[model samples]
Target: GSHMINAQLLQSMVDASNDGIVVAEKEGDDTILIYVNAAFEYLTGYSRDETLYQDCRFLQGDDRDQLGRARIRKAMAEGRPCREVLRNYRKDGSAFWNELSITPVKSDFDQRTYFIGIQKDVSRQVELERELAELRA
Candidate 1:
């Protein structure tokens, strides 16, 4: 189905989203987080105050391999959308599977203003997928 969503409606949708949602502004030299939803706090065990205006890189832990970070950096540098599955640590230092999709958003004036990040805590899903793959093998 196709539908049109206004700004208020969009915000409502994001708030109600099951996935963790973040909107970041591409400032002069850095990305500043503008909005993070409740799911993000729930998933990462971080309060809104701690996450807002913070770089998403904070989620990266020692377990996050260099290749994954390189890919994310490359995509952001090129203003391209990126989708990747990687490991991230919660505030409690527990590791989890992070399925992240980041897309650049442009304003009506054709200027890049922000990026929308849709993140899912997919540890259970990854476990199921791994088990299924092993069964198949």
Candidate 2:
């Protein structure tokens, strides 16, 4: 028997954040999203109805063979954590740079497993970097 982790505590932590937060079921070979915080909905412009029961692959454009995706897949497959800056799209088809981190957790009392992902909008950071590059040229 596993010790149950406090969902409320996790909820509080994520809800208290300014970054987008997502929690998904860790079904073998599949990551089905179950929780998306308001920040997530606002960040991606998609509602829970569109995200829940689906994988976060939608965040990726065509789920392309991005190096970042590869790193994420490898992390999940190996039961490790991964962090990457991804090119994600909003529901309105606008692009935003997302700094994403994915980690796995399990219910201490139950065997129920989960994957929590945090996404921070870094489009402004990316833009600033680009601007700096231009200014330096």
Candidate 3:
């Protein structure tokens, strides 16, 4: 008796994750977000309607001079996974530390490549880490 997880089961698991999840497809020169989980909406304060059919860079807002952006761009171009922490803004314009990881996935069925992004809000954690570092110093 073999029981394999189907798309519905996978979706259910993804929906329940605490970290935000996004799936973007490579479209010509841009990556368009096609799927976002409930946690993504809550973390970014943007609805799925607003996030879909667009790039995840909106979370960066106008803060585009980040070094991590270049690293992420290079990794994506090479079809490799990327892990970076970025300062992202919510819909209310509040800045938060986003610990993001992106993995490239190629679909044989669709003959396209998709990027799966996992986002975690690590604002408080970062602050605490810095506090401990300064105390030890």
Best by lDDT: 3
Clashing pairs in 3: none
- In model 3, the worst 10-residue window by lDDT is 1-10
Residues 1-137, candidate 3: write the lDDT tens digits.
23686878878999988889999999877899999999999999988898899888888989998988988889988989999999999998899999989998888988999999999888999899999999999
lDDT, candidate 2, 1-137, per-residue tens: 23676877866887767788888997777789988888888999988788889888878877576788778878888878888888889999998889988998877777878898888988899899999999999
lDDT of model 3, residue 61: 82
Order the candidate numbers by TM-score, best to worst.
3, 1, 2
Error of 1 at 50 (Å): 0.8
lDDT agreement of model 3 with the native: 0.90
| Candidate 2 structure lDDT | 0.84
**What TM-score would you give candidate 1 relative to the actual structure?**
0.79
For candidate 3, give the lDDT of residue 55.
Answer: 82
* TM-score of predicted structure 3: 0.88
Residue 69 in candidate 2, Cα distance off native in Å: 0.8
lDDT of 1 at 2: 30
RMSD of each: 3.3, 3.6, 2.4
Which rank order by lDDT, best down to worst? 3, 2, 1
Kindly report which residue stretches of model 1 are placed more than 4 angstroms away from their true locations once superposed. Answer: 1-3, 108-112, 128-137
